[PDB]
């Protein structure tokens, strides 16, 4: 027939499945096309120790998502002790969202799966809803599993009249398979999504993601912590305190400080090549000044 | 060729043996539609598990379940038959899917989930055949309850920016609902749960006249659901569910479940660091956490 | 063909395969318990439809030679959703004297090669073979908003000129504004099936409860003056809910429906009608 | 379906890929349709020497983008020394932006690719997101590469509610594939964009383009530099005071001085042809400046 | 030769059947002088100074002023005296009721213009098409009006193609800030102002009927106050009055019919 | 075309404007061929309300001026057929090419060839090949050749007196009552459209016929009033 571009998902999500260690899974063409976006747990290079600035959020996520997956002998006796069916990572953009997502993909346990909603929308009629169903079918087939939807503020957007029929049907099927009729059993299928704009997400999807973790912008202590974490392996001058830098920033996020340290290292490398030099804490001041002058362009 | 119905024919047979049908001869499309039949014994929720509202439950039981049984009493009257549509509308969360499961389990006749994703097909002239086979199967076994979850997305408001197959299916649904051959003594009822009935339709809205408003829980309903949830789990003796219900004032039927789950998780976390009941102190902390987290939209 | 010949009453069956497949689709006037007495409230529209379409079919001796009385090709019954359209169509299918046939465009779209123009030609060949015939396409808005569409349009425009076959295309419509630009013009006769007014509401309410054991002091005029916006199906649902509420006092352990049950049903229906707002 | 539009670019992207130097790259239909917009390195005829007026920006770009591409032995040990994942060239319209982009399309090494967001949007449903994914797929397939998004203040605009679902999905997928779950690894895939309205670009795309270069309106020294650069190939007299016209303009951008020089040359050719090669004697420049000022005044 | 290219080719005016020269445009003569040496001279005789990098015709010619009085007449005459392939489509031929069918249309237009020799492009009423960029407007034409700028002078442009785009507007104050940049040579088509009116009146009355002696200087200040296009429509009223009077009983014109046409045009206002 | 200019009543001023402008081609030489600006417009268009004598106006303009007419039939390779039709219409001079439903009518190459042929004909001859086939709704009909149709007239409801004249001209064909007058019916029609009076008279005749079929007589004022009331209720 037509649309036979699934001739390489089954040959692409099989060698990728052997890297995870699944023995006997009987899937269809749509299920394999969905599983073609599974992430390898060993392909990540960031653990919980690489995420600084916030500590209570890490422990909360670990005891809400990671803990109920293991120690099943203690959480299966009670009626309501299973992990939630949704984790909404909201807050300002930059620090925390994708890093916590990678930490959950690597060190959390059960098979992680990225959705990438671009593969759900198809050209042919009656093909996007089948893929949306195969998503949850594969999630149920692989217990447990964590369905990750990055930028969930666009795919599962607020419903209105100016929406395509296939996208609206997929958005309805998502909430009809989340906690629908034949769902809500002991399946350990959790759906998480990181988004910087949770104001216009939805009204029916917002309740299906009850555990909402606010990853705020780093404060003074958080900025000091992330500045001390970033300048750990690279050569830095012996007496360089990260408190004055974090106090001087006062508006930098977790990604702007990374750029500031990268700019300082690049300035040191350029000064060395013009003629291995450590950051004498003087380049940090001019880097902060240049970054502030650049950020002042939005106003 | 679309020769996958074979597997849909090997999944709509064993399930049939789980329901107890003896002689029902169907076609390929009818079998593919019946492949979504729900097992009544697979549900684990009855009318006793739905608290907070009682008049709505009694109304639904006397409107849907009561006409199904005692057919000798309603066979003489002309307008004493079950309706052809039940629209469960209201705010999202509490009541809709729970009442759907209760009607699937403890209501009687064979329940069927539509799952409109299977109606839309890639091949031309295949979605309308499945839409017809839906009602064909519904009439084939009487009675039956056709459930369409989130019906405000499949039978949307008819406009010009709609595909030919979807528009044809939406027209065939209302043509086979109360058209030229239906509306006889068939006892085929179609129900649907939705949280946005404002933009559902103009012709489908009248075909579902029995509309049950599953409102958002009030003080009494909040206390009722809080007492129902905290029933089997261990809790302190002097814990008044009225206090937390009056303090909340802003949760639906699903947010209180999350609050109780968070309280139990806090208890089991404080225990696992070194079985502890909730002393009504973790309840307030979970309520404050959920109230400070629900401000993400604003 | 022969499987459904029991009602056409003509031994002129020379149908082919497509004609045979289309012949299994005409309506069954036997199991149609609807006449002009069943439809209430709108009697002027009924008599208009009658003296416009019906006598051109039954009266076949006065106009026989050439006379101007002709069945208008294309009758569009348009209005709000409910209250009359399919009921009038079914009454016509019952007692129009002609072979009524339903379309249901879902059967036209064949999967093989996407060729659905052959069926669009076969349906018209069948309608002309056993004239008079009324081709009814329910929900004609979604069906006509594309080789089959042009072929069917040209067929309907070209074959209905010899005034030898009384084939008439009739359609019901709840959204007449977005129907079409040429189809709306192609149908000369348009019947506006309005929603029941203060008098039509009372008429249909009195017609709904006739054989039931209703109380003596139940003035339907008060119910009509209390509804103020109820459609045809809404009043039937209200009466059904009132009957269920009256029988609820007996099933829990035959009671005549009083005014209190009707008032409670009206209040419940008016509260429920605010779902779309 | 739409396999025709994707069967022509396939016969066009291959030839353009033959002269670039990609040896073995296996692409799909969407990847080939995206690669069909690759720019030829030899077609660009503007280098760093042809861009005057700004000097610190040039060396900053050479150290930030051009330097980490080569000499990989120095930036392979540390954790954060790779080239950035975005270069936002913001400033008033005129000088710098498109010229710097054209210069980097030739004198940067790695394969340059223009996005041309007009080809991303498609008529069929579920086709624009596939092309947006194929963009980054092709970028990762050949390393390194520079994805240029001209006038990025329109495609990756500020997210709101009055936007189409396809453009919103594409805008979300761009930032999801920029620094998402499987793209933070070292891949040398850099995305740059030139725009004249950075105030309403975005809140999540702005952080993904940390290196923000401001191309200001030419000042006195910059105006003198560009006026001396432009009046180098054309025939001019011996003595030309470039500071005079530079101080006279006081409001001309990098493109208005080019127009003034063109108008002076056209006046010279008109005076020559009217009789039947004449060098500008620093008098047609003042008249052209006055005419350009009168034209800019009468525009309102 | 794509599909959108062939769809655009339906608006490509043939360079042979134009029959519009500088003689048809009377009245204003200063704008014609500055446009001949700036647009026609660099386009033609390219074998003289092709070595120079900035001796090419400007790609941003724009003619503003009141509506009418020779706006597109100068464009057609220029394109006829220029190389070939006058290309005007519409102010609203684009913006089809689809998704991704408006920017691709402009892309096809520009590709077709690049395919052949300069092929002067004329965009009638660029004021509303390329209006000032903002964030409150519908976010479907802003991306299009930005792609137009990105394709006008971008990466692949600035070659020896001579592709010159010509615009037209009635109020170039809210047009743009980056589009006016690539439009450096902007001519000012003014109002006739008591002289060009008489000139165009003497021009139009040349190839016509008998037209007995009536000095155009007489009806020069008591004529239509503006809109020379209505002066083109004013002589039409005299012609219809001269051809509609003889049916009651070819007739030569005089001051009476012209004055009555003037009074009728004034009453129309 | 069997239509007559005197039969179609209504806007008498528009009729004279047509019989002057469009029939300047019917006028001999030295009147429209001598002056360059006195020639009639090339490619006249017609737009306005739906129906109301859309094709009837073109038929009357072709019959009164005696100009040759030919049906374009846009519903019935395409570019070649269009070029052949244009050549056939331009050969037999003078001739008018009338099209049906031009508002919704390779097609682009055919339109470009037709526009080029019309431009060449106008540059060669004054009014040899005319084109009058534009339908209603010309605001967004098409954008193929805008300069081809620069002349048009908004044919709408002229006035109540024109409606009364049309009713008197259309009703004076069958048997009518003495007291029943078309002016008395138009005084109560309250601004009915052009095609509305014909359908109202048809409904009155159908009522008068049904009066005998239910039990032939001439139409009366009561039947006309009932038909007008039914048309207003159905309007
Ligand atoms: N706690 C942290 N420890 C180390 N690095 C951090 C931390 N927080 C942020 N970062 C830096 O931020 C970058 C990741 O940003 P990320 O991808 O999470 O943005 P995002 O929040 O996903 O963007 P958006 O809000 O648009 O989705 C990494 O390069 C990392 O160096
Ligand atoms: N009366 C009740 N008794 C017990 N639990 C309840 C009650 N009402 C709601 N719940 C809780 O709500 C959850 C079910 O939510 P449900 O699936 O009905 O949401 P929904 O209304 O279907 O959402 P949407 O409106 O988006 O379709 C269950 O987990 C259940 O614990
Ligand atoms: N005049 C009437 N008298 C009695 N019952 C009526 C009348 N009109 C409508 N009904 C009731 O309405 C129901 C039929 O609805 P109806 O056929 O009018 O809907 P419809 O207009 O065909 O729907 P759609 O607009 O989708 O075609 C019947 O069950 C009948 O009981
Ligand atoms: N430093 C320079 N050296 C030489 N030429 C220059 C310089 N700066 C600007 N120019 C001139 O400017 C023109 C390029 O303008 P460009 O396309 O960069 O405008 P832009 O800023 O991209 O416009 P927009 O902001 O609308 O995208 C070239 O023709 C070039 O001659
Ligand atoms: N000075 C003039 N000399 C000769 N003809 C003129 C003159 N001014 C106007 N006309 C005539 O008036 C007509 C319309 O004038 P013009 O082309 O200036 O309008 P326009 O502003 O281009 O209209 P639009 O804005 O719709 O494009 C032309 O056909 C032209 O023949
Ligand atoms: Mg992210
Ligand atoms: Mg639900
Ligand atoms: Mg109906
Ligand atoms: Mg630019």
Author numbering:
A (entry chain D): 43 to 317, 328 to 351
B (entry chain C): 44 to 317, 328 to 351
C (entry chain B): 55 to 199, 210 to 317, 328 to 351
D (entry chain E): 43 to 318, 328 to 351
E (entry chain F): 69 to 317, 328 to 347
F (entry chain A): 86 to 161, 169 to 197, 208 to 317, 328 to 347
Copy the relevant paper text.
The mitochondrial AAA (ATPase Associated with diverse cellular Activities) protein ATAD1 (in humans; Msp1 in yeast) removes mislocalized membrane proteins, as well as stuck import substrates from the mitochondrial outer membrane, facilitating their re-insertion into their cognate organelles and maintaining mitochondria’s protein import capacity. ATAD1 is a member of a large family of proteins called the AAA (ATPase Associated with diverse cellular Activities) proteins. Six ATAD1 subunits rotate and translocate progressively to form a hexameric spiral assembly. Each ATAD1 subunit consists of two subdomains, a large subdomain followed by a small subdomain, and the nucleotide is bound at the interface between the two.
Δ40-ATAD1E193Q formed oligomers as assessed by size exclusion chromatography. 3D classification of the particles resulted in two distinct hexameric structures. In the second structure, the subunits are arranged in a similar fashion as the first, with the exception of M6, which is in transition to convert into M1 as part of the AAA protein functional ATPase cycle and now bridges M1 and M5, closing the hexameric ring (96,577 particles analyzed). This structure closely resembles the ‘closed state’ structure observed in Msp1. To initiate the subunit translocation, the M6 subunit loses its bound nucleotide, and translocates upward to bridge the gap with M1. Meanwhile, the small subdomain of M5 rotates toward its large subdomain, allowing it to establish contacts with the small subdomain of M6 in the ‘closed state’ structure. While examining the interactions of the mobile subunit (M6) in the closed conformation, we noticed that it is held in place by contacts on both sides: on the side of M5, substantial contacts exist between the large and the small subdomains of the two subunits.
